[PDB]
Design a protein around this ligand. Structure first.
Ligand code: BR
Ligand code: BR
Ligand code: BR
Ligand code: BR
Ligand code: BR
Ligand code: BR
Ligand code: BR
Ligand code: BR
Ligand code: BR
Ligand code: BR
Ligand code: BR
Ligand code: BR
Ligand code: BR
Ligand code: BR
Ligand code: BR
Ligand code: BR
Ligand code: BR
Ligand code: BR
Ligand code: BR
Ligand code: K
Ligand code: K
Ligand code: K
Ligand code: K
Ligand code: K
Ligand code: K
Ligand code: K
Ligand code: K
Lengths: 228, 236, 226, 223, 250, 230
């Protein structure tokens, strides 16, 4: 039930891997930077829709919803990108269907893009099925955050998702041949958070470069993702 | 890649368990023989025709299907429609509570479907009970649904093409199972999973007997679309 | 150097006798389900601790991560029993675990089964040999760094073993005769003791009162000699 | 008709208690363990023949026939042994007519033999007649197992034998039919200890079980 | 063993290979037609110096197997369909590895007996003069290969994979990858089926892992040929010169 | 070593699937002609199969008289076994020891309905998917077995047991062991089935002898009293 709801949410908020845009894809500045910004802001509405489809999420104080969302947006944008992309081939696929190459992105994302592809690769070598990934993505947002009004409520939804993930992995001796798979899975969240600090560094860099000022929406993003 | 498409196909053609319409749901046994069968037999025909566009939409979303000769696509879909309908129904319903949930979100009790479906509805609930006791995950179920249609059919223009698409799906299902077990396959589980198809085929012949019965009774004659359904499903 | 590192590995992976938890200790000469789950917990709770120990053995962390897992997985039960036997108090029937918990023999027999009696016996024999920390730290390392099938680098393994062997050899001489053979002779004795540990888990799986979790089932399969 | 065929199947597959083989008997190593292995392997064809004489068994899918036999063999071997032996005198009498004293079997069977003698004593203290026993033995095998091709066929045949035992009990008439069926679960538990013995012997590695015994092991495992 | 509780790991049991086996049997000396005429295991009877003799022998054993291994390669189903150019590239790129693999498989490491594609049986001590210290590594490899007890059907696939592998400068490398995959899936299905439907990923990783080890082992062969030419005592003839350049990974 | 020698004996005495002779194959419709061919296929395999027999380690160490007796007694069985293993039943393609390829339908006139029994056995055999090493042992076993009139029944029993041992080791370590519990048994079980199968071959030759349409050559007429269960 919950797992099915988590999977539908994922499916409904992701591009059909049979409806991808390769118009500007080529495995061969101010232009690539603004693009970096667009991609980020473009996924904001997509991921927000996804969050609203997480059972129990709409039952949290609206204030707690925006706090959870905003604090995890970047992590969510990167985890989703990492899961649907083809690391080996260096093909990046965004929440909107656009497909760029690891090299075309390096001009906008910076060397961070290389850190992302590496994460994408480690993530895929874990062979995470759609159900386990749908739980993990939800766990990246439904987690403890400073400033929460209903921290106990967040913790309850969190534990419900981990339990849902645990049953999926251990049902009928599903864990026998993958001992700490559940632990390795959860372990990807702190790695993801560490990974996203470089996204903040990049945004800071572009702001100090003052070659192309970040939009208020992203300037805002910088502050919401800021751990402190 | 292939399995994601298959899961997307399934998800997109099924109702979110939040769109579930529990309005026409009646569990009181007494309030059951109320209202002549006509209304119930019609409901039966409608539920079947109602899922046609839906399942055809799912079939069109199956990678490789459209590359098959247009006549084969039609022979495969028409021959498997009823089985798809029954399988999808059996996977999403709640057998323990005697609740049937259709390709459209309508929730009827077993006791209500008996008026239209006939005793066949009990064989269906039993099939649902066996299917759900296996705890098939969505990725696995989406492959099985696909394999109920992408399967051998006599009078197929390019049977070798279908066989290849079929192998591709089977192989996609084996990887899922094997990858979730640390790289070690599970041949018995797999055969138990694939064995549900012959069972589905057998279960549905009873659906053909219910339509034949309705045709003979001639009280609520099957409309042209159900007539076609009957002939497309006839194993001979 | 090697000996020092081996001792540090031991010390850092063991509880100080002044940080023990007696909250669950009861020697008066609970649900059966509770004792069995406790048995499973004491095993799973020691895994990370003992893994930490292994990773502190000079060279181990240099072997292919594949070989590491194979050596660790095949010796864990033995490492658990040996460390428990070395630190416990046979005479007083006090079993002391990797995590500091103290349990009386009588409390363990309901979870561990009669096998706890064989462990207390082994712990008694081990202690009568008055083995010092340096020597015990070498034996412990040898219990794991030993011949195993499936090792991507069998050479890289016998390399460590022998070094550790010589280390214990020089330590016995420098501090001094048929004593070195009595020490290594404890390893085959250890492995036999652990076959009884396998019987206990096999029994619990048959009784099906409380099936072993996946982690314990794998432990079961990994410890099987074949 | 059924009870008769069941009794006949039983008599034809058991040794004439007047022509027992004592050539290896003695009331005073690796050999006893080997003998433990042989007794088991020798009773296989004998019990297989018996199963083959159960009305309706041979009609089940071949796969199911092999599945039920392979899964209940150890229990059938033990049950049949407990029934024909003499617990009071500590004499174990096997399917093949061989007679050994408890003191000989403990060396091969292990302390499991004592549990077998205990079960034998409890069984015989119930004064179960040959007709009733012939039903219970059949129930030890024609029961539900995970993997049946036609689980219904099995349940079909099972109730039929159960009804067969029911009538025989009523005519001769109490909770007896209860204590009767109760022995099966007890027999099931008793044999797990048999699995423990075989497992211990495999670990010990002294005298390795032959391929056929390892097969029996994997075949009986309840998990 | 894959036959126990440990080996099953919680599970329960349920043409191309034949051609590959024939290719192998036809291209190998009957172990009953071996030539022991020059087999001298006596440390003392190591013919009076003359490094030249042994070095030329080294070159001859190599060239003497070329036509044989080329024949075998031509019996690999699907190989011919490949562009002649790729056939040549794959063959020349793998010849050395194929030569050592086959030698390692048929030889007797425990007795120090090296048995060549042509039937000649030489002792390890005789080969060290020609092959150099490299012969000891081959023997080690041989020893490790045989401890796996790989049956003829399995080895025939591995030998084929030593050649049907990606190489830089391929006309149709995709057609190559498809033959390679066909052969690997053939090996997997054969091992799985023969294990009662239960796959053996660890065994399979070990079998295929032997190829990287073989590639590495042969670089030492290149080092020997490089040495012999640097030493210029018995320069490498034109055919060995080509062998060297064909095997160069760069 | 023995098993490896058994495999070479098999490979050397069998036709490469790329060197087959279809100059007579058809697979579709189109007499004293079919019967003569039936006799030729049998006599032609004789030399081939005898060549294989001599390649079996230890077989040449038996008294020549025991060699002839063992060979002669198993000829038909070997002919059928080898035919069933290499042929392709699904497509009804019979491939003989000599490379000649005929369709099932082309054989029914000379072989009789027995050809249908062979194709079935071929079908059952192939479903077992016996690998070459195991098959090479079973073929050897069909011949190295007990027969009445052996001069050295103990020597034969010894070569036989060495072969089954060779087979048991290969099956346990390469054919799944207990993961295929009844394989070794089903495999040896094919020998008695093979023998029964060939009795129909004797009946065929009997029939042809009674019809006297074309008298069997001494070789085969011999094969008759050389295969006869007595
Ligand atoms: Br849902
Ligand atoms: Br894992
Ligand atoms: Br998709
Ligand atoms: Br899934
Ligand atoms: Br699978
Ligand atoms: Br009767
Ligand atoms: Br009697
Ligand atoms: Br086992
Ligand atoms: Br298990
Ligand atoms: Br061939
Ligand atoms: Br050449
Ligand atoms: Br191996
Ligand atoms: Br494996
Ligand atoms: Br594999
Ligand atoms: Br292995
Ligand atoms: Br040979
Ligand atoms: Br083969
Ligand atoms: Br003799
Ligand atoms: Br089998
Ligand atoms: K993993
Ligand atoms: K209805
Ligand atoms: K499989
Ligand atoms: K299963
Ligand atoms: K009676
Ligand atoms: K072989
Ligand atoms: K495999
Ligand atoms: K078979």
């Amino acid at each position: 039930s919950l797992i099915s709801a988590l999977v539908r949410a994922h499916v409904d908020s992701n591009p059909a891997m049979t409806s991808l845009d390769y118009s500007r894809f080529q495995a061969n500045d101010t232009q690539h930077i603004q693009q970096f910004y667009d991609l980020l802001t473009g996924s904001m509405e997509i991921i927000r829709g996804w969050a609203e489809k997480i059972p129990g999420f709409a039952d949290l104080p609206k204030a707690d919803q925006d706090l959870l969302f905003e604090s995890a947006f970047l992590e969510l944008f990167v985890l989703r990108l990492a899961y649907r992309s083809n690391p080996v081939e260096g093909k990046l696929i965004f929440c909107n269907g656009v497909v760029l190459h690891r090299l075309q992105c390096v001009r906008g994302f910076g060397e961070w893009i290389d850190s992302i592809v590496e994460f994408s690769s480690n993530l895929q070598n874990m062979n995470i099925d759609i159900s386990a990934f749908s739980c993990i993505a939800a766990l990246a947002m439904v987690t403890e955050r400073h400033g929460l009004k209903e921290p106990k409520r967040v913790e309850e939804l969190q534990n419900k998702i981990v339990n849902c993930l645990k049953d999926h992995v251990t049902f009928n001796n599903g864990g026998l041949n993958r001992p700490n798979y559940l632990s390795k899975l959860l372990g990807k969240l702190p790695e993801l958070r560490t990974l996203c600090t470089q996204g903040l560094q990049r945004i800071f860099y572009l702001k100090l470069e003052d070659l192309v000022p970040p939009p208020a929406i992203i300037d805002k993003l910088f502050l919401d993702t800021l751990p402190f």
